[PDB]
Amino acid sequence: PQITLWQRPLVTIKIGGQLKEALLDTGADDTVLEEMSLPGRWKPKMIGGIGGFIKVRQYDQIPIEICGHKAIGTVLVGPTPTNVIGRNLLTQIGCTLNF
Amino acid sequence: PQITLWQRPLVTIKIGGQLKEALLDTGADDTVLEEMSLPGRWKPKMIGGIGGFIKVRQYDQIPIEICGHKAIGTVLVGPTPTNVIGRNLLTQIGCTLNF
Ligand SMILES: COCCO[C@H]1CO[C@@H]2OC[C@H](OC(=O)N[C@@H](Cc3ccccc3)[C@H](O)CN(CC(C)C)S(=O)(=O)c3ccc(N)cc3)[C@@H]21
Ligand SMILES: [Cl-]
Ligand SMILES: [Cl-]
Ligand SMILES: [Cl-]
Questions:
Q1: Contacts with A9 from chain B: Cβ below 8 Å
Q2: Which of A30, A95, B10, B91 is the most exposed place for a label (fewest CB within 10 A)?
Q3: What total of structural domains would you count in chain B?
């Protein structure tokens, strides 16, 4: 699809069988989701944005469907204000910016 | 242009007679720039991201050129860790996500 930016670019994702809403975010290097359960082991990461840093849990090689497009990659979980799909997964689903 | 998301989507902007690098950020409602002077009225605003909120000055009706494309809109100025072009100006240059 082509998504214009007059409203937030919120899409439905599916992860661990569950539907969630997430923001397609070209300003995020990494995908970060609100608190949830994921399988396997996690590693620590500190991520920074507007108001400073948060600690998150890094899960690798997680299947996730984004607007119907399949991806498998790194998902960070922590106290983000909103679910954000970052460039690590936007690249997997073939996303570009165009103007 | 078509802008790949393998790297951060950084572009050159011109604003208040200054050239600056900024991130094209579909996850930002608003354009937020590191400390700088702009002309005209402003009012204080809190904006919130990963890590919490920062106080910024909100300037309205500011001309900007992004990648050669002229636009006008609101610019927030304050202690953001990096210059971000948000949707309020991305719409004006006809920027879309495509996949
Ligand atoms: C809060 O009230 C609602 C509006 O609050 C937000 C939305 O609109 C407003 O405009 C300015 C601000 O927007 C943002 O801050 N946008 C961020 C996403 C976001 C969106 C909503 C809430 C919080 C964050 C941004 O696209 C990504 N961030 C990096 C960037 C800013 C360099 S990051 O998130 O820090 C990040 C860093 C690393 C990874 N790996 C992942 C993410 C305000
Ligand atoms: Cl990844
Ligand atoms: Cl505006
Ligand atoms: Cl349009």
A1: 26-27, 97
A2: B10
A3: 1
Q: What distance in Å separates the CA atoms of residue B87 and residue B28, rounded to the nearest whole number?
A: 6
A70 touches chain B (CB under 8 A): no
Q: How far is the CA of A62 from the centre of ligand 3 (A)?
A: 37
**Does B49 reach chain A within 8 Å, measured CB to CB?**
yes
Tell me whether strands A43-49 and A2-3 are parallel, antiparallel or unpaired.
Answer: unpaired
Write the DSSP symbol of residue B36: -
**Residue A66 to residue B99: CA distance in whole angstroms:** 11
* Token pair listed for A13: 């994702």
User: What is the full DSSP assignment across A46-66?
Assistant: EEEETTEEEEEEEEEEEEEEE
The method recorded for this entry reads X-ray
- CATH code of the domain covering residue A8: 2.40.70.10
Residue of B nearest to A68 (CA): B99
Taking the C-alpha atoms of residue A30 and residue B19, their distance in angstroms, rounded to an integer, is 28
Domain membership of residue B78 as a residue range: 1-99
DSSP lists the bridge partners of residue B3 as A97
Residue A90 φ/ψ, nearest 5 degrees: -60, -35
Residue that is written with structure tokens 């103007």 in the block: A99
Resolution value, angstrom units: 1.4
Interface of A with B in 11-30 (CB under 8 A): 23-29
